[model samples]
Target: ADQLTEEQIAEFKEAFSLFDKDGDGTITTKELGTVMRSLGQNPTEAELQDMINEVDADGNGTIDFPEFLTMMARSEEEIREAFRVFDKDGNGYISAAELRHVMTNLGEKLTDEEVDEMIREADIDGDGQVNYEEFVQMMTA
Candidate 1:
């Protein structure tokens, strides 16, 4: 994985701050649900409880920044692995055409315009290719 940019690290810290309610240095499931809701994700009560059970390390019913970082780090690794699987040529980047093919394989049926928009959204450098750093930033954002 590439080193996280200063901007990316700042963004992560901002997100962490938002999740850390009560200023007590930990994020509870309730806080996480609140953040998710703010981001327009409507998790059901049961789903929220399940997320807590799944992510809350030490069974303390709360997730600290380190725990959250661990989860995100693992997800980044998985995304890089998926990128390698999708980039059959091992080009170190995912082109718009390749993205379209990959999305279709995943049952996404996106139009070329849709795929182009997706690419534009993810390709921070505007280079028409998604590298691992850009992919992680886009996914997290």
Candidate 2:
């Protein structure tokens, strides 16, 4: 799996710092919700609680950076498989058109405009391509 390299680990740590709202070196469900909301997706209370129940190790109801990293690292193989499925052309990265094709193949009927908007949302850097790093960041951010 093309998992996070050391540099990517540092990037993830920096991103996680912004999510640890209480600044106690741990992220709570509330803090996670704040981060999700900032990304334009509001997690319901039930969803938030479920996330905590599933991911918060150490029986602490809060997630330290290390715990979160461990979870992500463990999921790398599954993530890579999903990405490969989306990368229909076997390219290392997913182009906007490729993503649209994949979505259509998955039974998602999107208008051209809708596909463009989806691409824009996934292409966070406006680069017209969603690489593994970008995909992982979007999923885990």
Candidate 3:
């Protein structure tokens, strides 16, 4: 229910601009890691592995500000918030139908059989449904 709005995204954009450091659009691993460790945990290589690159959807080596936000999302509450965006009906589990639409919205192409296999991979409980816990685990993994 608390999906981000244009205003909120713009606000975050502005906030991230503060960390731009050298007028470059992307934040390099070194700059990002230094800033991150300064604020919280040690930004060692292993942690930095989880903190970047994978979230760099644009295929660049570094990360955008929003990507940094995803790296910071270790809390269950934060994961739950991300889950809400895909669970369109708030049904507590992501149906194949929901998955189909979400993937479509992201411009990802999936056949029926492929989507079925994905649900199988996602349904960690073997209950024929994908709950938030599994979703979070897969996301963070």
Top candidate, metric lDDT? 2
Model 3 / residue 78 / CA error / Å? 2.6
Please give the CA lDDT of all the candidate structures.
0.71, 0.74, 0.69
- After superposition, the stretches of candidate 1 with alpha carbons farther than 4 Å from their true spots are 1-11, 75-141
Worst 10 residues of 3 by lDDT: 34-43
lDDT of 3 by residue, 1-141 (tens): 646557656756654654455667777767666655543335687677565667776767777776866544434776776677668799899888877776555445679887778889878888766897789888665
Q: Clashing residue pairs, candidate 3? A: none
TM accuracy, model 1:
0.47
Q: Pick the candidate with the highest TM-score.
A: 2
Residue 16 of model 2, lDDT score: 69
Ten residues in sequence with the least summed lDDT for candidate 1: 101-110
| Poorest stretch of ten by lDDT in candidate 2 | 101-110
RMSD of each: 10.2, 10.7, 14.4
The predicted structure with the larger lDDT, 1 or 3, is: 1
